[model samples]
Target: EDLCVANTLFALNLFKHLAKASPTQNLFLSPWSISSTMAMVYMGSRGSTEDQMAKVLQFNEVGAADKIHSSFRSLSSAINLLESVNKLFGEKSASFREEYIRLCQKYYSSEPQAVDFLECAEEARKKINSWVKTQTKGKIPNLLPEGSVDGDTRMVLVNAVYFKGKWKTPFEKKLYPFRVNSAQRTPVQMMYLREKLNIGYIEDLKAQILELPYAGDVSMFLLLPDEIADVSTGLELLESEITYDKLNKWTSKDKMAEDEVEVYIPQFKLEEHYELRSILRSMGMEDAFNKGRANFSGMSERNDLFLSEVFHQAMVDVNEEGTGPQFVADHPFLFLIMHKITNCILFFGRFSSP
Candidate 1:
């Protein structure tokens, strides 16, 4: 029972760390960037978890930031409660007890938690998803899977992200229909546009960096991979500086030919799931994974728990319901990362089309 308590608390703490890791100061500006970065975190904590962890985030507009932060705060509260439970059952470890109380003060602050923490967590998850759907004009379907959620679990962690933006070089709608299907037969929609403007686009190798600008010229770079290549490789190439240099040099603002060519922009929506245990533990979270782990001394009754597994969900799309032309990202878009404390991101993921 004690180990179960610790397991629960540690899971909650990991959720807090995610909030801390997910904000404007912590992750990227794009909501997808948050999912992509946390993919690393999820992989890190995957094997150490057993209960359940889930995330819901969005790439929409109008109160998007608020929605993301609210989700983080809700998860943070769950973590604080875990600490409280530890102290309530095991007060012998004074240092652990003090830390738990401090954490409680940080999130629960003045709220009462006489109720079950699991229910509280569910409330947060619902809030995040609801806000995302509302903000995006309902373009995104259920980002979090219905059954992926834990129905009767004691605890869970979830994040919901939403963002909205337009193409830097707006596409014209009359030229092409906005919807189509993929090789996988997945339905995709186009962000109809008409422009002979200069963008970071290439022709020879069928690759280019299309810049989609938003509120502050904060753009989502779409890299269209070659028809013969895999989109995953395109994403991998994006992580390297060489790719950046090649992309920037090839596509120039002055290089685009002003012809009314109907660009059949393929709208894409995708979801990915992966294991993240070794990735997180190697990143200095060795404590939670070890049997003799420290820093969780206040958790009551148990000492034999470790992270057993971690899982996450990510989704993003540009569609008609949005203020911007719907260039539904056919390729994987690494949504932005976020830091809840101040609501900022450390780094944003660079996305490209496949």
Candidate 2:
């Protein structure tokens, strides 16, 4: 319960950062993927390195390594169509500590996959990518691309999460024009469903919140700015002002109510890749990425270990059959896949174009 709130906030923080860095571009990521990977890293981190990571990964709220990992056991399973797997691929000769592997098994249900990073750098990268590829059922074909991992890499902690689901009441598909902005438009296979949904209008944020559930407790929430009240009427203002707490209020029972919302959402598919090293650095996690000063002695007694790169890839397809109001998502908008039971975001992204 407490852990998911932390994930939600971290998801929003990362979402804002990505939006700022790559505005006018389609955005998507798995907060669970990155956070769990960091949690694994933090388990082996020490001193200021652990502290900086604690703040950025939102582990500060939970406070203990044991509790965070244990809670993650429940958090990861509660969501549907999200296949999350974590593994620490250590160098064949680095000799990782026994205790570290044991905890990963006990809490995270993972056994360290040993790979030879020393002699076969390209092979190691390929092996890691293949491992991820198999876990996600090939949705994420190549997570860590060429040259992302190298011989100098001592250990790589990877978390790959796959997001996929069918709507509870699938919408009817139709041909329509999607508005990218005031002038530009593109043809899209739009979907419509006029049913009673947990829809609401936020007076403060000036946006409409629509929730469309999947077959289970998981649902997709769209944040579209109210047409008349305009980021120049894009998601700029809404994205800027929306926070974890306020978002809860906006979507809460008091704010949102069920209604027959005539919704028109495009049948969209998104596959986005992110390299989080610089982004994590921008967010104040400095020492973990520093080659000279990083300390991972908890996992190994050695001192030369540090993170090389953090790679994340996610894909989501919003299409027919299970599942609103007059919510016409015909333009650029921010959307998130939320596990309602846990109240945490499984996937977060923006649909900018056709």
Candidate 3:
């Protein structure tokens, strides 16, 4: 429960940074993927390196390593119930500690797959990409491109989560024009629905909140900025004002008012690929990427390994078969696909264009 809150906050913080860095580009990421990957790596980190990571990831408040592992054990199962894949891969000759491997399986239910990076870097890349393709149902392919993995590569931690579920109340798909701004518009397969739905108007952020439930206890939330609002200012307000406590409080049934809403959402698809080494380093997770200073002795007694790169790819398709509300997102807006039961965010992104 506590870890989920920490991760949710971290996700928003990272999104704020990425949005500031690239204001115009569409954004998408799996904070769950990045956090799980780091969790696996944190188990193999020690000394000041681990301390830095703990502070950045909000793991500092957690009692001990065992309790953290136990929390993930329950968390992982809930995620896996949504049809996800979480795994770690290391160089065949890396010689990982047995205790680290044992904890990965026991807590995360993950095992490191060994591949020969030293002798055949290209082949190893192909094999890893193939695994990712299979896990994501072919939606994301070639996550690791040429030169991403080389002869000196020691380990790669990977996580892929894919979900496709029907909406509780289906919408009618029709051809409609999507408004990008006051004067610009584009042809889109617009989905329209008229129904009573759970929604709230957030005055501070200047955005309307709408929740669309999936087949199970999972749902997608949309944050549509006021038509004339400043995009960057709205984003900043969203980051600073929307905390875990406020989000849950706002979305609770008692707090939200159900009313008949007319929703117009475009059928959209987005795939984003990110090289996170620099982003994380800039966020004060520096030692893990520093070859000379990094201390990952828990993985091996020798200190020859450091994070070369962290690759993350995520894709989401929103269509008419799910629930939506009078929440017309004609302009750019932020969205979150999350598990309501566990309160874990599976994916977060902003849909900027067609």
Candidate 4:
């Protein structure tokens, strides 16, 4: 949990060094181009194992063990800072009003807003985008988009979702359009591609694997259950360990044959909103809102301040020069989760393809 905080924050900071792109590029092309390329690397690690790779990846960039150690040090500083501030001022009856006042004193945006936290997130997005655009050579968009993201979406907790991959072989897109549903089989606009891809397969498991390559040194492993299977069961079986083990467990290749296949990929966008308080409550982080959860009495005297609600959404699309080479079936896919986060990934779930 601790490392996740640091690693995610680090990635967020790094992404801020990239330029914003169109919604298409943001979800599909740009994510793979940047830290999303590293998503697999990070998500693949668990517990202290993450700590080892976290430092190793930066070894060449910043040549010191101390510098590496400093990553967590900063994270510690952030946690401590929040704790101290909360303790000092978060325990009072005027928690909401006081927090509003503190935000004004600390960091306020020029966009002219009423709510303090919302304004803070908005201002931070603009500031982060300024430098990110310069670093990525304008390959990526300003990171944040519209509706779901507004001036009121201040001091956002962002999740940078990126997926990139190249096909084992190319697929002709001229025959790749399939009417599919973005939410329910409601007939949404979509484009799909089809072809015989040299894919990896596990017959015993009734699954097919497709490798997706991107402009950057990245690849997306798309696994589909070939049989009428429970997508939920498959996802429930997925985890860092099982994911790697299954991917590596494929031992037969020469026996694999090229088969005609059709892939339907959706060419659509969505803004799915969610509130994370209940989810967190189930996750054992109840102390965040519990007046007696912890000794957070250092930041303020108002204890009534509990996390109100966390809003988050994502967008995605797959097109040519993008991430796959296979039959674009543009069908519904299950995005099951082993864990959930909105506070941590307050700014996550935003997917855009170029």
**Top TM-score: which candidate number?**
2
Off by over 4 Å in 3: 61-64, 181-184, 231-241, 252-255, 322-325
Q: What is the TM-score of each candidate against the true structure?
A: 0.42, 0.92, 0.89, 0.42
What tens digits encode model 2's per-residue C-alpha lDDT throughout 1-354? 377778887888888887778877788888867777777778788998988888888878645655777787766666535566767788777667899889777766778777888899899989898888888777667778778788888777776666679788878876677777666778999887888889888887678889888877888888888754443328777777989878889889888888888988899888887878788888888888898878888877777777776777777767785633578888778888887888777888888887
**Candidate whose lDDT is highest:** 2
How much is 299 displaced in model 1, in angstroms?
8.9
- Of the pair 2 and 4, which is ahead by TM-score? 2
Q: Residue-wise lDDT of candidate 1 within 295-328, one digit each (tens)? A: 2333222343233323333334443332312223
lDDT, candidate 3, equals 0.75
lDDT-best of 1 and 3: 3
Listed per model in order, the count of residue pairs whose N, CA or C atoms clash below 3 Å is 75, 15, 3, 66
lDDT of the candidates, in the order given: 0.34, 0.79, 0.75, 0.33
Question: Number of clashes in model 4?
Answer: 66
- lDDT (tens digit, per residue) of candidate 4 on 72-121: 33433342200001001111222333443443233311111123333444
Better of 3 and 4 by lDDT: 3
Ranking by lDDT: 2, 3, 1, 4
